[PDB]
């Protein structure tokens, strides 16, 4: 029950925030081109 809950929680959070990080990596360079090395 303990390792069960912990590992389920960790996997769910990992998947969710993996998706969110993918989306943010998609939409970063547009809204923050000052970091984009394309213009440097």
């Amino acid at each position: 029950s303990v390792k069960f809950m912990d590992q389920k929680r960790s996997g769910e959070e990992t998947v969710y925030f993996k998706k969110e990080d993918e989306a943010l990596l998609r939409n970063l360079l547009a809204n923050h081109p000052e970091y984009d090395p394309k213009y440097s």
Partner: protein, 52 residues
Amino acid sequence: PWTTDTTFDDIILSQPSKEDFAKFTKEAPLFLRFLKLVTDVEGRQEAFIQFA
């Protein structure tokens, strides 16, 4: 060259206006690099970000 939407004429004979002028899309990056440099020197990055 043939175009289905544009026509070539003399500027003084046409007396064209801004909307009579034809529009196209130009590639930015070569200009945007130089612009980033110039704005980093001059100290106005808001303008670079807005324009980009």
